[PDB]
Design a protein around this nucleic acid. Structure first.
Length: 95
RNA sequence: AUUGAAAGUUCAAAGCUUAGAUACCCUGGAGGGAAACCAGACUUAACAC
């Protein structure tokens, strides 16, 4: 747990900045304008969120057997590049 | 009974292409195979007297 001023720098440096290109299939040259950058969040990164549910009974069956069998999920975009596979750990069994 | 409810910034996309660790560059300069050293030492034996 770092002080915030230095922590922002460490964290902003922990992000992945990638250049990507589009190459013409024929001559293996880069197509004109096909150059851009994207930011990724690395593996092992942990986010924290909460699911809130009202009392209705379909919520009960949802939370019963929809979320117990829910471990891995695809979040975000660019999934064909294999981005976005996520593990959901419920803080009701672990700790 | 909330200017509310509902809605995945998602999809396609190769950090690739061209590109000689090359060019110039004396293992050279200085440095006595020298220094020391006796071709020498000594007669002995035998019998006669």
């Amino acid at each position: 747990v770092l002080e915030d001023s230095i922590g922002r720098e460490v964290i902003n440096r922990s992000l992945i900045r990638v250049r990507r290109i589009r190459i013409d299939r024929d001559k293996k040259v880069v197509e004109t304008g096909g150059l851009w950058s994207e930011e990724y969040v690395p593996m092992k990164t942990i986010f924290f969120s909460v699911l809130l549910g009202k009392e209705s009974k379909e919520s009960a069956i949802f939370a019963s057997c929809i979320l117990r069998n829910l471990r891995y999920v695809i979040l975000g975009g660019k999934e064909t590049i294999g981005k976005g596979i996520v593990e959901l750990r419920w803080v009701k069994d672990v700790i």
